[PDB]
Each structure stands twice: as C-alpha cells, then as structure tokens.
Paper text:
Archaemetzincins are metalloproteases occurring in archaea and some mammalia. They are distinct from all the other metzincins by their extended active site consensus sequence HEXXHXXGXXHCX4CXMX17CXXC featuring four conserved cysteine residues. The overall structure of AfAmzA resembles those of other metzincins, consisting of an upper N-terminal domain (NTD) and a lower helical C-terminal domain (CTD) with respect to the active site helix α2, which harbors two of the three zinc-binding histidines (H117EIGH121) and the catalytic base Glu118. On the other hand, as the homologous archaemetzincins from Methanopyrus kandleri (MkAmzA) and Methanocorpusculum labreanum (MlAmzA), AfAmzA exhibits a second zinc-binding site located in the CTD immediately below the catalytic zinc binding site and close to the eponymous, structurally important Met-turn.
The 6xHis-tag was removed by thrombin yielding the full-length protein with three additional residues preceding the start methionine (referred to as NHis-AfAmzA.). The first three amino acids of the NHis-AfAmzA construct employed in this study are the remainder of the N-terminal 6xHis-tag after thrombin cleavage and will be denoted by negative residue numbers, thus as Gly-3, Ser-2 and His-1. By the bidentate coordination of the (deprotonated) amino terminus and the carbonyl oxygen of Gly-3* the zinc-bound water is displaced from its spatial position between the zinc ion and the catalytic base. Furthermore, the metal-ligand interactions are similar to those observed in crystal structures of metzincins complexed with cognate proteinaceous inhibitors such as serralysins or MMPs. Contrary to substrates, the artificial N-terminal overhang is positioned in a parallel manner to the edge strand ß4 and does not form backbone-backbone interactions with this substrate-fixing element. The crystal structures of NHis-AfAmzA and nat-AfAmzA show rather large differences in the substrate-binding site. Despite different space groups and solvent contents, the conformations of the molecules in the new crystal forms are very similar to each other but at the same time they are substantially different from the original tetragonal form (NHis-AfAmzA) with respect to their active-site binding clefts.
Residue numbers in the entry: -3 to -1, 1 to 160
Amino acid sequence: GSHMKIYIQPLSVNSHTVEVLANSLPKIFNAEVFVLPASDVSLKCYNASRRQYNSTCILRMLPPIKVTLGVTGKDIYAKGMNFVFGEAELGGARAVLSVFRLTTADSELYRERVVKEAVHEIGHVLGLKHCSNNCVMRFSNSVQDVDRKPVSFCRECASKIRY
Ligand SMILES: [Zn+2]
Ligand SMILES: [Zn+2]
C-alpha cells in the first residue's frame, strides 16, 4: 500500500528531540518517517537586529518534498510576531518547528509539547486550518495554549486527513 512520507530535517537541534519525533510521528500519521542528515540552520535566515531566525526563510530553504519538516533549537519568528513555534505551507510540502520556546524542566512535558507542535504543523501541510474543537489544530501562540490542547486530531480533522 501507499503511505504518507515525512522527512525530518534537523537544523541546529539536539538528536534527542529528533528521535522523539521519529518515534512518534509514524503512528500518528500512518507515515514512513525518514530522518535526514543533520545540518546547521542557515545563517542567511538570521536577523541580526532581532537575534532570531526567520521561519519563512528556513521553510523556503527546505526541499519541496511532501512532507518535509525542519526542526531547529534556535528561536524563530515570522513577520509581525515576537516569536513563533513554527510555520507551514498550508496544503503544500514544507514546515518548520522550533523547540526553543517549548523548553521546560519537565522532561515529559517537553516531549509532549514537541510532538504537539510537530503534529500541528504537519496538519497544516496536509491542508488543515485552525480548529475550534478540543484538537491539536487549535491555534497556539503560548506554551500554556499548547499544554491545554490535546495531541490528537478531533474527529473532524481526522476525517479531513484520512478522506
Ligand atoms: Zn497553526
Ligand atoms: Zn480539529
């Protein structure tokens, strides 16, 4: 049979974080998941004034192969935002996640946050808009938001992925 493909591109991030995603995403998306060789997040995307990397810039440096998720440990932002957790091509091929704003001394919680945000961004790539249900596709702009939504897709979003 056929399966969705997810390529994880490590971009200046620890290997542990990558492995959390490698081991969680296959079952969530019924996907063949591939971890690409690590590289440094591009200096071309560094904004010297903000001292942050731009998410749109990083995303657009990835190869446009559905679905490729860049994962970085560096703080990222996007136009008009103090920071973002990530960015995605809605219905496209590419997304990026930063774990910088997700860090926490609660190691189990950190893992949960990383999976939630990866799942959310990949959901956007698959064409899902933000959702008002108890759903991972709820908008998140703070970690409290992330902690208070579940990791699972609601029945409406799950349907849109599957059919
Ligand atoms: Zn979103
Ligand atoms: Zn939903």
